[PDB]
Write a protein that binds this ligand. Structure first.
Ligand SMILES: CCCCCCCCCCC[C@@H](O)CC(=O)O[C@@H]1[C@@H](N)[C@@H](OP(=O)(O)OP(=O)(O)OC[C@H]2O[C@@H](n3ccc(=O)[nH]c3=O)[C@H](O)[C@@H]2O)O[C@H](CO)[C@H]1O
Ligand SMILES: [Zn+2]
Length: 300
């Protein structure tokens, strides 16, 4: 039996929230079998819990923001979610004392190190996967995102930026997903901002925790970061990282093929919700026989 995974020990990471610019303490706790992925706001009395549910994504303006019925929020969940998806963590209590996950370096890599430092633990319960059984597409003008049946997990993402710095790079990236391929190729890709946008958001009280230490900052012509890019096509690698993170909002790994053109938080959630609402387009699968598991889900 392919077992569910949790953490061996409680870990912590303190940083700043990208938008509030206020100190956030992220506490990752082991959870038993069948609890699922839980986001907790500890700064509240009583604390507020958010089960990983596609429908909780209510604001996709700046990031993937989870909002409950009383306007309690958890934002910037995508980078941490990518790490969780990449390592196949099923049961975990994600605790924050601020309305957002700390930005760290702007990628999923700090969260991967954090999961590794804690150690992955297997539980005596079968790991549930969402298997795509029909093609499901979503559109938003020229942009679209799709899921097709596939025995493993792949991502093919296309960006189209009419920017001197981004177009210079490769704008289409495709990979067969695995814990290894994610860590090596995707996890370290950082988020990116245009100085025009940052200045606008900052005067309105948003992006207060933004710096070069947490993002690729671009002007109207070039990358402003001293040390440059970590990858030639870091832009497209990050867009794929966000998609991995966003799709993980159902809190289970997906067995299927993802394709996108100009997708983002909004569209990634749209497809996720569209697939999940179409009863016949997916099913929960377990692997009582380890031999049946597709190669994509091999151990890290
Ligand atoms: C002295 C100290 C000062 C220095 C401090 C600097 C601080 C650094 C902080 C940076 C913070 C950034 O993080 C904030 C921030 O806004 O970052 C966002 C991020 N949220 C994400 O937004 P989202 O994933 O939802 O993508 P949208 O598709 O909704 O993009 C929206 C528009 O882009 C078009 N589009 C989309 C896809 C594509 O393939 N092509 C293309 O053209 C599309 O037509 C639409 O009009 O990606 C965006 C890019 O795409 C980033 O700008
Ligand atoms: Zn991102």
């Amino acid at each position: 039996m392919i077992k569910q995974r949790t953490l061996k020990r409680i870990v912590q990471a303190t940083g700043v929230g990208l938008h509030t610019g206020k100190k956030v303490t992220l506490t990752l706790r082991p959870a038993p079998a069948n609890t699922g992925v839980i986001y907790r706001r500890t700064d509240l009395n009583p604390p507020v819990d958010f089960p990983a549910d596609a429908k909780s994504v209510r604001d996709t303006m700046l990031c993937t923001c989870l909002v409950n019925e009383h306007d309690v929020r958890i934002s910037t969940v995508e980078h941490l979610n990518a790490a969780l998806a990449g390592l196949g963590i099923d049961n975990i209590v994600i605790e924050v004392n601020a309305p957002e996950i700390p930005i760290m370096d702007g990628s999923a890599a700090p969260f991967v190190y954090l999961l590794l430092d804690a150690g992955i633990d297997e539980l005596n319960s079968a790991k549930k996967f969402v298997r795509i059984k029909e093609t499901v597409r979503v559109e938003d003008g020229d942009k679209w995102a799709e899921f097709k049946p596939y025995n493993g997990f792949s991502l093919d993402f296309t960006i189209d930026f009419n920017h001197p710095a981004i177009d210079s790079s490769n704008q289409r990236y495709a990979m067969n997903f695995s814990a290894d391929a994610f860590m090596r190729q995707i996890s370290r890709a950082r988020t990116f901002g245009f100085m025009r946008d940052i200045e606008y958001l900052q005067s309105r009280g948003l992006c207060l925790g933004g710096s070069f230490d947490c993002a690729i900052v671009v002007d109207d012509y070039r990358v402003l970061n001293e040390d440059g890019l970590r990858f030639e096509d870091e832009f497209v690698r990050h867009k794929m990282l966000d998609a991995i993170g966003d799709l993980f909002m159902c809190g289970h790994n997906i067995i299927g093929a993802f394709t996108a053109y100009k997708s983002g938080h909004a569209l990634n959630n749209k497809l996720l919700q569209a697939v999940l609402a179409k009863q016949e387009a997916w099913e929960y699968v377990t692997f009582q026989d380890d031999a049946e598991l597709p190669l994509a889900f091999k151990a890290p």
